[PDB]
Design a protein around this ligand. Structure first.
Ligand SMILES: CO[C@@]1(C(=O)Nc2cncc3ccc(NS(C)(=O)=O)cc23)CCOc2ccc(Cl)cc21
Ligand SMILES: CO[C@@]1(C(=O)Nc2cncc3ccc(NS(C)(=O)=O)cc23)CCOc2ccc(Cl)cc21
Ligand SMILES: [Cl-]
Ligand SMILES: [Cl-]
Lengths: 300, 299
């Protein structure tokens, strides 16, 4: 029993964290086999950030301009290339601690663990979700760039995020491990802002099914709803549209609890209308949207 | 910016998790040097000295990854079983066994069959239970803090209470709380809110730019404790006020000035507003957790 925001064990990722320095800029890198992956803005100064020409800044660099430190050991850079917004530094030593891994690009609503690091040293691990507006509500101070997001299934680490920047509202933006940003963001200090964020509906429903599995049914009602009527109501509360794919994905949780997806939708409609009336659901006074259907099945 | 419930990196502890099987019971063990520590109920009104004397070393099967460790000795220390093995753990980190106080926080590496599945942050409640996330097979999972390169082990999971909360021991086998390792009618006592932690979380909210709850008022320690007692909040001591000193100096909000803000939140609610994305007052971040997360301390 119990339901917590749970992160994956971070050990396999801790053994990949290195410090990357170029000039006066120091950030984190991910060392897998003989390559160190890091944000390409490590080659920029503060002035360069307004309109940097990364190809022009990179051509002026040689291998020995990049200092890579793994623990108390200096790695030698023997090659470098840029792939989108990621810099790939070829080193002379393969990481003996390289886990079994994949690079995966995730969709909004998906969750992952973040290993926050400073100077190539891990400081903490937390769980979060890719928001519908493609930002993440993380906890990152200056120097955390290059910290990574991941999931672990079986013995395989799936890297899905690399941290690049903090937006003016305090939220964070980054890329997949191929250096493609999530969202309409650029690694430029131009006027950028997070779009209006919405609640991840399929995740709130999964969390309501987790509450039922743990013995809480106070919020259920005798009503049902059509998918279209549910969406017309939910959009009025800034909730993401619920698609047929979402209904299909909730199938297993519906079968385990005996409550139809559209009946759980009717319960959500009523919670949005009434609030909690001094009550909590799984120890929370707000409707939680950072647990996916997959996370609920895994933890419960 | 940002404030998350953050756990310590679990790598140093992952390298110590093993599977312990005795008869039909399988749980988790902690392998440090040549000893495996696990709950003594793995041998199970039990008489543990009588149940243990009937066991031989080969009755305990210890699995570290895909390798069987051979048990060469066994002894009991309070509610923990210590299994001497032939191989010292080459991944043994620098460590200490520490007993924590209610209100203190720690990371839990939840394990099943000696395999870590997740890491989360929690606090030892004033009633000595922990609000964890544990299923059958999680016994022997451990709680810890990391300071510098040293792992301080503070908790080992033993059981779940009827309200869904959890009970366990320190690594010397002494239970936290009035609990026993037997199937008997046991219940969590009435819990209270950890006041010093709620104040630390209010200082974290101010540091991150949330100030709507601040007011022009201050209070005295005695008046605040009369209010705290009414709302099932733990008494705030002079030690708590001293511990909040650094956060008070950084934000310019005196501890009894923040107590006056907390009194207003307790008497009037939040009025549709939130603090760090929460509609409840959070008490599972200590003053040290707030300082550590708002400064980026590494391990
Ligand atoms: C070079 O990193 C930038 C950045 O967003 N860094 C950060 C990432 N995470 C957390 C942070 C917390 C605080 C902070 N403060 S400050 C005064 O801006 O240095 C910066 C952070 C600095 C600001 O401009 C940009 C513009 C684009 C890009 Cl892709 C990166 C950055
Ligand atoms: C032997 O383990 C006991 C136990 O509390 N285990 C658990 C620990 N954590 C999480 C759990 C979640 C669910 C669960 N379900 S069950 C198997 O139907 O009891 C048990 C859990 C269950 C029997 O009563 C006792 C009596 C004393 C002791 Cl110290 C332990 C236990
Ligand atoms: Cl995805
Ligand atoms: Cl409140």
């Amino acid at each position: 029993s119990g339901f917590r925001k749970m992160a994956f064990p971070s050990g396999k990722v801790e053994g990949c964290m290195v410090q990357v320095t170029c000039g006066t800029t120091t950030l984190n890198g991910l060392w897998l086999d003989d390559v160190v992956y890091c944000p390409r803005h490590v080659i920029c100064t503060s002035e360069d950030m307004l309109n940097p020409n990364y190809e022009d800044l990179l051509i002026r660099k040689s291998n020995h301009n990049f200092l890579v430190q793994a623990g108390n050991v200096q790695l030698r850079v023997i090659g470098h290339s840029m792939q989108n917004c990621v810099l790939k530094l070829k080193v002379d030593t393969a990481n003996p601690k390289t886990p079994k891994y994949k690079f995966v690009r995730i969709q909004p609503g998906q969750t992952f663990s973040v290993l926050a690091c400073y100077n190539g040293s891990p400081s903490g691990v937390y769980q979060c979700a890719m928001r519908p507006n493609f930002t993440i509500k993380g906890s990152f101070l200056n120097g955390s760039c290059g910290s990574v997001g991941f999931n672990i299934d079986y013995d395989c680490v799936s890297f899905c995020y690399m941290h690049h920047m903090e937006l003016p509202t305090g939220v964070h933006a980054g890329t997949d491990l191929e250096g493609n940003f999530y969202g309409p963001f650029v690694d430029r200090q131009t006027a950028q802002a997070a779009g209006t964020d919405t609640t991840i509906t399929v995740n709130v429903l999964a969390w309501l099914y987790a509450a039922v599995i743990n013995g809480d049914r106070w919020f259920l009602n005798r009503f049902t709803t059509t998918l279209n009527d549910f969406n017309l109501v939910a959009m009025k509360y800034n909730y993401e549209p619920l698609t047929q794919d979402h209904v299909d994905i909730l199938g297993p949780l519906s079968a385990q609890t005996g409550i139809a997806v559209l009946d759980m939708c009717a319960s959500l409609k009523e919670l949005l209308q009434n609030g909690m009336n001094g009550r909590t659901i799984l120890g929370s006074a707000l409707l939680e949207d950072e647990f996916t259907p997959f996370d609920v099945v895994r933890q419960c």
